[PDB]
Each structure stands twice: as structure tokens, then as C-alpha cells.
Design a protein around this ligand. Sequence first.
Ligand SMILES: O=C1Nc2ccc(F)cc2S(=O)(=O)N1
Ligand SMILES: [Zn+2]
Length: 257
Amino acid sequence: HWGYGKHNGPEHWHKDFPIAKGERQSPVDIDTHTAKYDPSLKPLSVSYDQATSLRILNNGHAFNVEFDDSQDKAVLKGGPLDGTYRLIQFHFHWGSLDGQGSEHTVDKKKYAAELHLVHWNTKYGDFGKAVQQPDGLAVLGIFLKVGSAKPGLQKVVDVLDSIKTKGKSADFTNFDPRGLLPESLDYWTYPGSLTTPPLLECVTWIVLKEPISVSSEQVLKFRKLNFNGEGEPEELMVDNWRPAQPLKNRQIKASFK
Ligand SMILES: O=C1Nc2ccc(F)cc2S(=O)(=O)N1
Ligand SMILES: [Zn+2]
């Protein structure tokens, strides 16, 4: 099965998932000098006041904080998007060292981690139908750098010991994802894909320019998670990031000068 190891990592994924070599794969390097300001892009609208978190799950490649998406409660709209996209889950990608971990890069810079807030287009009715469409998902990507702690992340960090291994979940209600957002919503946007198999080309990527700061202790606790299940040999869940993929015939657009 696919993973992030030497024999099953990103360079192998194309054998089971040939779209890995497709025309709109993610992540990508964001060349800040070539990204063009698009004055027709609107401000992002992030409406998370009614978000209902339910559960946190170690799925063997990251941990997902899942939300009730059976109603319009936490939605992303505006920006490059047409219509309304409902928050379904968020998760992170991170490194074994502070010098790597993000999936997107900025002028080849790798951040310590990257948060993905995943939303699906309500016109397709559910997530499973949305991923079959070129405009089915909108993923808000936020870089993490190591410095001061992020207070709004600590409730996540503190539950990780209860979901150490693949397949473990824990109740995780009343978590407010607004506490994970930077001050500015300036962003880059481009059409891309899921960054894990099945690598479907269904994502409008919206990557925020401003990183959030998290403490060394916070990211160190991400690195204590396990890829393996309980009672299997311990493999630390680190370096669960796909590297940048060829941009091909795409343009990255900036919301800001
Ligand atoms: O690792 C990732 N796996 C995903 C899997 C399913 C998604 F809906 C979105 C993503 S993602 O591209 O945001 N990141
Ligand atoms: Zn992701």
C-alpha cells in the first residue's frame, strides 16, 4: 500500500495511480515573482462561526479533525470560487526536522508544516461526488513556521497521545478552527489535485501567504504519532509530505500586489 517510505513513497505512487503524472498535480512550488496579481479575484470569505467539529482520526498518513458537513455551517466562498464549499476536515503535513514538512513551497522554501482545510462544493451534494469533478474541492492551505506557540492549536496537540496509531479516533467536539488562521487572508490560487492517492484532479488550491507560528514543542508532538497500527513495529509519522510537482500548463494567481 502507498505511503511515505523508500519503497512505497511519492516516487512509486504513479504505478497504482497513473494520474500522479497528470496535468494538474499538487503540490507545486509557488514562484512569487511569476505569480500574477489578478484584480478580478475577490477576498476570501471564511465563515467558520458555526463549525461543528466531531472527531479526530489517525488514518495512517496524518490526523484528520472531522466536522459535521450535513448542513451549511462552516463554509468557504469568494476568492476564486463560484458557489459554496463546506468544511469537511482539516489535517497537517509535517517534517522530521523544522527545515521541511510543507507540501507547497514558496520560492523553493519549505515550511515546517502545512495545514489543509478541506471543503467540498455543495452543488455536488456530497464529498464523494465532489471529488469526481474538476471544481469539486477547495483546499485552504496554511504554512506553519516554528517560533511562538499557536494557542488555538494546543487543544489538537494535547489529544494526539490518544490517537497515536493508525485507526485510532477520539471525540473532538467544540474545536474552533478560526484559531488556526493567520491575520491576513492574502492568497495564491491555482488548479490542482489531492496530494495523496487517489491524487484526483478536483481541487481549487487557495494557499495563504502569511504563515502561522507554532512552537517547537507543538510540532514535536506531531512527530510522536505513528504511521503503524497498535501492536505493529513503531514508525514515526514524520515527512508525510509529497514534494512539489511540475506546474505544466498552469498559472498561479495572487490576490494581492
Ligand atoms: O494529503 C492530502 N490528502 C487529501 C485527501 C482528500 C482530500 F479531500 C484532500 C486532501 S489534500 O490534498 O488537502 N491533502
Ligand atoms: Zn493535505
